[PDB]
Subunit: 143 residues, 3 copies
Amino acid sequence: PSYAVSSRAGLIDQERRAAVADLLTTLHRDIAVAPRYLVQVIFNDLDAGALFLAGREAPEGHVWIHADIRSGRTAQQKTDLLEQITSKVADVLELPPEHVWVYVNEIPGENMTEYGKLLPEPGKEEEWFATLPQSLQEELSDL
Amino acid sequence: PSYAVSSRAGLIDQERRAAVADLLTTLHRDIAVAPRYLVQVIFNDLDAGALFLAGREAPEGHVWIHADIRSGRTAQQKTDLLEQITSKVADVLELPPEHVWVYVNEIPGENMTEYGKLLPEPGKEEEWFATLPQSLQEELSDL
Amino acid sequence: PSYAVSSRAGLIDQERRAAVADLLTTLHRDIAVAPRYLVQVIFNDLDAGALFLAGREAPEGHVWIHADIRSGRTAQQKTDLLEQITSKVADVLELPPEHVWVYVNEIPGENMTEYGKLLPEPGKEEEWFATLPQSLQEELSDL
Protein backbone atom coordinates (compact mmCIF):
# COMPACT_ATOMS: atom_id res chain seq x y z
CA PRO A 1 0.00 0.00 0.00
CA SER A 2 1.23 3.46 -1.02
CA TYR A 3 -0.79 6.50 0.02
CA ALA A 4 -0.14 9.61 -2.06
CA VAL A 5 -1.42 12.76 -0.37
CA SER A 6 -1.86 15.87 -2.51
CA SER A 7 -2.29 19.31 -0.94
CA ARG A 8 -1.15 22.90 -1.41
CA ALA A 9 2.49 23.18 -0.38
CA GLY A 10 2.44 24.54 3.15
CA LEU A 11 -0.90 23.06 4.17
CA ILE A 12 0.67 20.08 5.94
CA ASP A 13 3.48 20.86 8.41
CA GLN A 14 6.37 18.47 8.67
CA GLU A 15 5.00 17.42 12.06
CA ARG A 16 1.45 17.10 10.72
CA ARG A 17 2.93 15.08 7.84
CA ALA A 18 4.42 12.83 10.51
CA ALA A 19 1.02 12.56 12.23
CA VAL A 20 -0.81 11.85 8.96
CA ALA A 21 1.71 9.17 7.98
CA ASP A 22 1.39 7.59 11.44
CA LEU A 23 -2.42 7.61 11.22
CA LEU A 24 -2.70 6.23 7.66
CA THR A 25 -0.17 3.51 8.50
CA THR A 26 -2.13 2.71 11.68
CA LEU A 27 -5.62 2.68 10.16
CA HIS A 28 -4.21 0.53 7.41
CA ARG A 29 -2.77 -1.97 9.95
CA ASP A 30 -6.11 -2.16 11.70
CA ILE A 31 -8.71 -2.06 8.90
CA ALA A 32 -6.67 -3.96 6.38
CA VAL A 33 -5.01 -6.75 8.25
CA ALA A 34 -1.57 -5.90 6.93
CA PRO A 35 1.79 -5.22 8.60
CA ARG A 36 2.86 -1.61 8.88
CA TYR A 37 6.17 -2.31 7.16
CA LEU A 38 4.28 -2.54 3.85
CA VAL A 39 2.90 0.99 4.08
CA GLN A 40 4.40 3.87 2.11
CA VAL A 41 3.12 7.45 2.41
CA ILE A 42 4.10 10.15 -0.07
CA PHE A 43 3.30 13.86 0.12
CA ASN A 44 2.93 15.63 -3.23
CA ASP A 45 2.94 19.34 -2.45
CA LEU A 46 1.20 21.55 -4.99
CA ASP A 47 1.85 25.10 -6.23
CA ALA A 48 -0.45 27.97 -5.25
CA GLY A 49 -2.99 27.88 -8.07
CA ALA A 50 -2.56 24.27 -9.10
CA LEU A 51 -5.70 22.71 -7.58
CA PHE A 52 -9.19 23.22 -9.01
CA LEU A 53 -12.64 22.06 -7.87
CA ALA A 54 -15.65 22.41 -10.17
CA GLY A 55 -13.58 24.38 -12.63
CA ARG A 56 -12.70 26.95 -9.95
CA GLU A 57 -9.61 27.29 -7.80
CA ALA A 58 -9.84 25.16 -4.67
CA PRO A 59 -9.92 26.39 -1.08
CA GLU A 60 -6.50 26.20 0.53
CA GLY A 61 -7.79 23.56 2.97
CA HIS A 62 -8.30 20.78 0.44
CA VAL A 63 -6.55 17.40 0.45
CA TRP A 64 -6.74 14.52 -2.02
CA ILE A 65 -5.61 11.06 -0.87
CA HIS A 66 -4.84 8.43 -3.54
CA ALA A 67 -4.23 4.93 -2.20
CA ASP A 68 -2.92 1.93 -4.14
CA ILE A 69 -3.96 -1.27 -2.31
CA ARG A 70 -4.05 -4.94 -3.24
CA SER A 71 -7.19 -6.36 -4.78
CA GLY A 72 -8.96 -9.22 -2.99
CA ARG A 73 -10.17 -7.35 0.12
CA THR A 74 -13.76 -7.47 1.29
CA ALA A 75 -16.17 -4.70 0.38
CA GLN A 76 -16.54 -3.90 4.07
CA GLN A 77 -12.89 -3.28 4.92
CA LYS A 78 -12.48 -1.16 1.76
CA THR A 79 -15.39 1.16 2.54
CA ASP A 80 -14.47 1.13 6.23
CA LEU A 81 -10.93 2.21 5.34
CA LEU A 82 -12.31 5.01 3.16
CA GLU A 83 -14.70 6.39 5.76
CA GLN A 84 -12.09 6.24 8.49
CA ILE A 85 -9.43 7.96 6.35
CA THR A 86 -11.82 10.79 5.49
CA SER A 87 -12.77 11.04 9.15
CA LYS A 88 -9.47 10.81 11.00
CA VAL A 89 -7.37 12.80 8.53
CA ALA A 90 -9.91 15.63 8.56
CA ASP A 91 -9.65 15.75 12.37
CA VAL A 92 -5.83 15.40 12.38
CA LEU A 93 -5.51 18.31 9.92
CA GLU A 94 -8.40 20.29 11.51
CA LEU A 95 -10.31 20.25 8.20
CA PRO A 96 -13.95 19.49 7.40
CA PRO A 97 -14.39 15.93 6.10
CA GLU A 98 -15.94 17.51 2.97
CA HIS A 99 -12.41 18.55 1.96
CA VAL A 100 -10.50 15.27 2.47
CA TRP A 101 -11.15 13.35 -0.75
CA VAL A 102 -9.99 9.71 -0.86
CA TYR A 103 -9.67 7.36 -3.86
CA VAL A 104 -8.78 3.67 -3.63
CA ASN A 105 -7.27 1.95 -6.68
CA GLU A 106 -6.93 -1.81 -6.29
CA ILE A 107 -4.15 -3.64 -7.91
CA PRO A 108 -3.24 -7.38 -7.75
CA GLY A 109 -0.45 -8.25 -5.34
CA GLU A 110 1.64 -9.89 -8.07
CA ASN A 111 1.70 -6.44 -9.69
CA MET A 112 3.72 -5.07 -6.77
CA THR A 113 7.27 -5.46 -5.51
CA GLU A 114 8.15 -4.21 -2.04
CA TYR A 115 11.38 -5.15 -0.25
CA GLY A 116 12.57 -6.69 -3.52
CA LYS A 117 9.87 -9.38 -3.67
CA LEU A 118 6.52 -9.73 -5.39
CA LEU A 119 3.75 -9.20 -2.89
CA PRO A 120 1.18 -11.90 -2.12
CA GLU A 121 -2.55 -12.04 -1.81
CA PRO A 122 -3.95 -10.06 1.16
CA GLY A 123 -4.06 -12.28 4.21
CA LYS A 124 -1.05 -14.37 3.11
CA GLU A 125 1.59 -12.09 4.65
CA GLU A 126 2.86 -14.75 7.12
CA GLU A 127 3.55 -17.18 4.26
CA TRP A 128 5.23 -14.38 2.27
CA PHE A 129 7.30 -13.31 5.29
CA ALA A 130 8.65 -16.86 5.79
CA THR A 131 10.13 -16.70 2.25
CA LEU A 132 12.26 -13.61 2.92
CA PRO A 133 15.96 -13.94 3.75
CA GLN A 134 16.54 -14.09 7.49
CA SER A 135 18.30 -10.70 7.59
CA LEU A 136 15.34 -9.09 5.83
CA GLN A 137 13.04 -10.93 8.24
CA GLU A 138 14.57 -9.28 11.27
CA GLU A 139 14.78 -5.71 9.95
CA LEU A 140 11.08 -5.90 9.03
CA SER A 141 10.12 -7.35 12.42
CA ASP A 142 11.79 -4.36 14.10
CA LEU A 143 9.22 -2.09 12.38
CA PRO B 1 -13.16 12.54 -11.02
CA SER B 2 -9.69 14.01 -10.69
CA TYR B 3 -7.69 15.07 -13.72
CA ALA B 4 -3.98 15.24 -12.92
CA VAL B 5 -2.05 17.23 -15.51
CA SER B 6 1.71 16.91 -15.70
CA SER B 7 3.85 19.15 -17.89
CA ARG B 8 7.16 20.94 -17.72
CA ALA B 9 6.88 23.82 -15.26
CA GLY B 10 6.20 27.06 -17.08
CA LEU B 11 4.49 25.52 -20.10
CA ILE B 12 1.01 26.15 -18.69
CA ASP B 13 0.49 29.67 -17.29
CA GLN B 14 -1.79 30.21 -14.33
CA GLU B 15 -4.19 31.74 -16.83
CA ARG B 16 -3.99 28.57 -18.94
CA ARG B 17 -4.33 26.43 -15.84
CA ALA B 18 -7.64 28.25 -15.39
CA ALA B 19 -8.64 27.60 -19.02
CA VAL B 20 -7.60 23.95 -18.99
CA ALA B 21 -9.35 23.25 -15.69
CA ASP B 22 -12.52 24.94 -16.95
CA LEU B 23 -12.26 23.03 -20.24
CA LEU B 24 -11.73 19.67 -18.54
CA THR B 25 -14.46 20.44 -16.04
CA THR B 26 -16.97 21.29 -18.81
CA LEU B 27 -16.08 18.37 -21.08
CA HIS B 28 -16.54 16.02 -18.14
CA ARG B 29 -19.92 17.54 -17.39
CA ASP B 30 -21.03 17.07 -20.98
CA ILE B 31 -19.51 13.71 -22.02
CA ALA B 32 -19.71 11.94 -18.73
CA VAL B 33 -23.07 12.94 -17.48
CA ALA B 34 -21.96 14.10 -14.03
CA PRO B 35 -22.28 17.33 -12.09
CA ARG B 36 -19.49 19.90 -12.32
CA TYR B 37 -18.87 20.08 -8.56
CA LEU B 38 -17.49 16.50 -8.60
CA VAL B 39 -14.50 17.46 -10.75
CA GLN B 40 -11.04 18.01 -9.28
CA VAL B 41 -8.16 19.15 -11.51
CA ILE B 42 -4.54 19.12 -10.34
CA PHE B 43 -1.46 20.55 -12.06
CA ASN B 44 1.80 18.69 -11.34
CA ASP B 45 4.60 20.83 -12.72
CA LEU B 46 7.81 19.04 -13.58
CA ASP B 47 11.51 19.74 -13.24
CA ALA B 48 13.45 20.82 -16.34
CA GLY B 49 14.81 17.48 -17.47
CA ALA B 50 12.23 15.27 -15.80
CA LEU B 51 10.17 14.16 -18.85
CA PHE B 52 11.35 11.49 -21.30
CA LEU B 53 9.71 10.07 -24.42
CA ALA B 54 11.18 7.01 -26.15
CA GLY B 55 14.17 7.14 -23.81
CA ARG B 56 15.12 10.71 -24.74
CA GLU B 57 14.15 14.04 -23.21
CA ALA B 58 10.70 15.17 -24.32
CA PRO B 59 10.12 18.47 -26.18
CA GLU B 60 8.86 21.18 -23.84
CA GLY B 61 5.47 21.20 -25.47
CA HIS B 62 4.33 17.90 -23.99
CA VAL B 63 1.46 17.31 -21.57
CA TRP B 64 0.25 14.11 -19.94
CA ILE B 65 -3.25 13.94 -18.45
CA HIS B 66 -4.17 11.17 -16.01
CA ALA B 67 -7.88 10.90 -15.19
CA ASP B 68 -9.41 8.85 -12.40
CA ILE B 69 -12.99 8.03 -13.46
CA ARG B 70 -15.81 5.91 -12.04
CA SER B 71 -16.46 2.46 -13.51
CA GLY B 72 -19.78 1.77 -15.22
CA ARG B 73 -19.70 4.09 -18.25
CA THR B 74 -20.24 3.09 -21.87
CA ALA B 75 -17.39 2.51 -24.28
CA GLN B 76 -18.56 5.42 -26.44
CA GLN B 77 -18.68 7.82 -23.50
CA LYS B 78 -15.05 7.03 -22.62
CA THR B 79 -13.87 7.29 -26.22
CA ASP B 80 -15.55 10.68 -26.69
CA LEU B 81 -14.06 11.94 -23.42
CA LEU B 82 -10.60 10.77 -24.50
CA GLU B 83 -10.72 12.05 -28.06
CA GLN B 84 -12.18 15.38 -27.01
CA ILE B 85 -9.63 15.94 -24.24
CA THR B 86 -6.78 15.23 -26.68
CA SER B 87 -8.21 17.68 -29.24
CA LYS B 88 -9.57 20.50 -27.11
CA VAL B 89 -6.69 20.56 -24.62
CA ALA B 90 -4.29 20.61 -27.57
CA ASP B 91 -6.08 23.68 -29.02
CA VAL B 92 -6.34 25.59 -25.75
CA LEU B 93 -2.60 25.21 -25.12
CA GLU B 94 -1.60 25.80 -28.79
CA LEU B 95 -0.02 22.34 -28.99
CA PRO B 96 -0.11 19.51 -31.51
CA PRO B 97 -2.62 16.83 -30.43
CA GLU B 98 0.24 14.34 -30.74
CA HIS B 99 1.68 15.86 -27.54
CA VAL B 100 -1.39 15.79 -25.29
CA TRP B 101 -1.38 12.25 -23.91
CA VAL B 102 -4.46 11.11 -21.96
CA TYR B 103 -4.99 8.05 -19.76
CA VAL B 104 -8.31 7.11 -18.14
CA ASN B 105 -8.26 4.87 -15.04
CA GLU B 106 -11.56 3.43 -13.79
CA ILE B 107 -12.42 3.11 -10.08
CA PRO B 108 -15.77 1.92 -8.62
CA GLY B 109 -17.92 4.68 -7.13
CA GLU B 110 -17.78 3.16 -3.65
CA ASN B 111 -13.96 3.31 -3.88
CA MET B 112 -14.26 7.14 -3.83
CA THR B 113 -15.03 9.74 -1.23
CA GLU B 114 -15.95 13.29 -2.22
CA TYR B 115 -17.52 15.92 0.06
CA GLY B 116 -17.28 13.47 2.91
CA LYS B 117 -19.52 10.86 1.28
CA LEU B 118 -18.94 7.70 -0.76
CA LEU B 119 -19.81 8.17 -4.40
CA PRO B 120 -22.63 6.37 -6.23
CA GLU B 121 -22.69 4.47 -9.50
CA PRO B 122 -22.47 6.85 -12.47
CA GLY B 123 -26.00 7.93 -13.28
CA LYS B 124 -27.25 7.76 -9.66
CA GLU B 125 -25.95 11.25 -8.82
CA GLU B 126 -29.43 12.61 -8.05
CA GLU B 127 -30.18 10.00 -5.35
CA TRP B 128 -26.74 10.67 -3.88
CA PHE B 129 -27.52 14.40 -3.81
CA ALA B 130 -30.78 13.65 -1.97
CA THR B 131 -28.81 12.02 0.87
CA LEU B 132 -26.71 15.11 1.60
CA PRO B 133 -27.53 17.55 4.40
CA GLN B 134 -29.43 20.59 3.18
CA SER B 135 -26.52 22.98 3.75
CA LEU B 136 -24.10 20.87 1.69
CA GLN B 137 -26.81 20.58 -0.96
CA GLU B 138 -26.92 24.35 -1.22
CA GLU B 139 -23.18 24.92 -1.82
CA LEU B 140 -23.07 22.15 -4.41
CA SER B 141 -25.95 23.87 -6.18
CA ASP B 142 -23.79 27.02 -6.02
CA LEU B 143 -21.29 25.23 -8.25
CA PRO C 1 3.21 3.02 -20.93
CA SER C 2 3.97 5.79 -18.45
CA TYR C 3 6.56 5.17 -15.75
CA ALA C 4 6.41 7.67 -12.89
CA VAL C 5 9.48 7.53 -10.67
CA SER C 6 9.19 9.19 -7.27
CA SER C 7 12.24 9.81 -5.12
CA ARG C 8 13.63 12.39 -2.74
CA ALA C 9 14.93 15.30 -4.83
CA GLY C 10 18.63 14.88 -5.50
CA LEU C 11 18.80 11.09 -5.18
CA ILE C 12 18.65 10.72 -8.97
CA ASP C 13 21.10 13.00 -10.84
CA GLN C 14 19.99 14.36 -14.22
CA GLU C 15 22.56 11.93 -15.62
CA ARG C 16 21.04 9.18 -13.52
CA ARG C 17 17.58 10.16 -14.76
CA ALA C 18 18.72 9.60 -18.33
CA ALA C 19 20.16 6.18 -17.54
CA VAL C 20 17.03 5.15 -15.66
CA ALA C 21 14.83 6.49 -18.45
CA ASP C 22 16.83 4.72 -21.14
CA LEU C 23 16.76 1.47 -19.12
CA LEU C 24 13.02 1.56 -18.45
CA THR C 25 12.18 2.20 -22.10
CA THR C 26 14.58 -0.57 -23.14
CA LEU C 27 13.23 -3.08 -20.61
CA HIS C 28 9.72 -2.21 -21.68
CA ARG C 29 10.66 -2.70 -25.33
CA ASP C 30 12.01 -6.19 -24.65
CA ILE C 31 9.68 -7.64 -21.97
CA ALA C 32 6.51 -6.05 -23.19
CA VAL C 33 6.84 -6.23 -26.90
CA ALA C 34 6.02 -2.64 -27.72
CA PRO C 35 7.91 0.09 -29.59
CA ARG C 36 10.04 2.53 -27.63
CA TYR C 37 8.16 5.56 -28.94
CA LEU C 38 5.16 4.75 -26.69
CA VAL C 39 7.17 4.95 -23.45
CA GLN C 40 7.01 8.02 -21.25
CA VAL C 41 9.08 8.32 -18.07
CA ILE C 42 8.33 10.98 -15.44
CA PHE C 43 10.46 11.93 -12.43
CA ASN C 44 8.42 13.18 -9.45
CA ASP C 45 10.91 14.72 -6.99
CA LEU C 46 9.94 14.89 -3.32
CA ASP C 47 10.69 17.23 -0.41
CA ALA C 48 13.08 16.31 2.38
CA GLY C 49 10.45 14.91 4.72
CA ALA C 50 7.84 13.85 2.17
CA LEU C 51 8.38 10.07 2.05
CA PHE C 52 7.37 7.72 4.87
CA LEU C 53 7.79 3.95 5.25
CA ALA C 54 6.08 1.95 8.02
CA GLY C 55 4.77 5.18 9.55
CA ARG C 56 8.33 6.63 9.75
CA GLU C 57 10.52 8.77 7.52
CA ALA C 58 12.05 6.70 4.74
CA PRO C 59 15.78 6.40 4.16
CA GLU C 60 16.99 8.69 1.40
CA GLY C 61 17.84 5.72 -0.83
CA HIS C 62 14.27 4.80 -1.68
CA VAL C 63 12.55 4.93 -5.08
CA TRP C 64 8.92 4.15 -5.96
CA ILE C 65 8.02 3.41 -9.59
CA HIS C 66 4.39 3.56 -10.77
CA ALA C 67 3.70 2.20 -14.24
CA ASP C 68 0.51 2.50 -16.28
CA ILE C 69 0.56 -0.29 -18.88
CA ARG C 70 -2.06 -1.70 -21.21
CA SER C 71 -4.11 -4.61 -19.90
CA GLY C 72 -4.08 -7.84 -21.85
CA ARG C 73 -0.47 -8.94 -21.20
CA THR C 74 0.53 -12.37 -19.90
CA ALA C 75 1.33 -13.03 -16.26
CA GLN C 76 4.85 -13.96 -17.32
CA GLN C 77 5.50 -10.62 -19.02
CA LYS C 78 4.25 -8.65 -16.03
CA THR C 79 6.21 -10.53 -13.39
CA ASP C 80 9.34 -10.47 -15.52
CA LEU C 81 8.95 -6.71 -16.03
CA LEU C 82 8.44 -6.18 -12.29
CA GLU C 83 11.43 -8.22 -11.14
CA GLN C 84 13.75 -6.76 -13.80
CA ILE C 85 12.75 -3.15 -13.12
CA THR C 86 13.26 -3.67 -9.37
CA SER C 87 16.63 -5.39 -9.92
CA LYS C 88 18.22 -3.32 -12.68
CA VAL C 89 17.00 0.10 -11.51
CA ALA C 90 18.36 -0.75 -8.08
CA ASP C 91 21.65 -1.61 -9.78
CA VAL C 92 21.80 1.56 -11.93
CA LEU C 93 21.06 3.73 -8.89
CA GLU C 94 23.41 1.80 -6.53
CA LEU C 95 20.46 1.10 -4.21
CA PRO C 96 19.33 -2.04 -2.43
CA PRO C 97 16.60 -3.76 -4.48
CA GLU C 98 14.53 -3.77 -1.31
CA HIS C 99 14.25 -0.01 -1.83
CA VAL C 100 13.07 0.08 -5.43
CA TRP C 101 9.33 -0.59 -5.06
CA VAL C 102 7.40 -1.12 -8.31
CA TYR C 103 3.64 -1.01 -8.97
CA VAL C 104 2.10 -1.66 -12.41
CA ASN C 105 -1.45 -0.46 -13.02
CA GLU C 106 -3.24 -1.93 -16.00
CA ILE C 107 -5.35 0.28 -18.27
CA PRO C 108 -7.01 -0.97 -21.47
CA GLY C 109 -5.54 0.37 -24.70
CA GLU C 110 -8.80 2.06 -25.68
CA ASN C 111 -8.42 4.11 -22.45
CA MET C 112 -5.16 5.66 -23.75
CA THR C 113 -4.27 8.42 -26.18
CA GLU C 114 -0.72 8.74 -27.49
CA TYR C 115 0.36 10.81 -30.49
CA GLY C 116 -3.29 11.83 -30.70
CA LYS C 117 -4.74 8.36 -31.41
CA LEU C 118 -6.33 5.72 -29.21
CA LEU C 119 -3.97 2.88 -28.50
CA PRO C 120 -4.68 -0.66 -29.67
CA GLU C 121 -4.65 -3.74 -27.46
CA PRO C 122 -1.14 -5.15 -26.94
CA GLY C 123 0.40 -6.93 -29.92
CA LYS C 124 -1.70 -5.04 -32.49
CA GLU C 125 0.83 -2.17 -32.86
CA GLU C 126 1.57 -2.79 -36.55
CA GLU C 127 -2.09 -2.33 -37.45
CA TRP C 128 -2.21 0.85 -35.38
CA PHE C 129 0.98 2.16 -37.01
CA ALA C 130 -0.48 1.64 -40.50
CA THR C 131 -3.35 3.95 -39.45
CA LEU C 132 -1.12 6.99 -38.86
CA PRO C 133 -0.46 9.71 -41.45
CA GLN C 134 2.82 9.14 -43.28
CA SER C 135 4.42 12.15 -41.60
CA LEU C 136 3.71 10.88 -38.08
CA GLN C 137 4.93 7.46 -39.24
CA GLU C 138 8.35 8.76 -40.16
CA GLU C 139 8.78 10.67 -36.89
CA LEU C 140 7.97 7.52 -34.89
CA SER C 141 10.33 5.53 -37.09
CA ASP C 142 13.09 7.98 -36.10
CA LEU C 143 12.52 6.89 -32.50
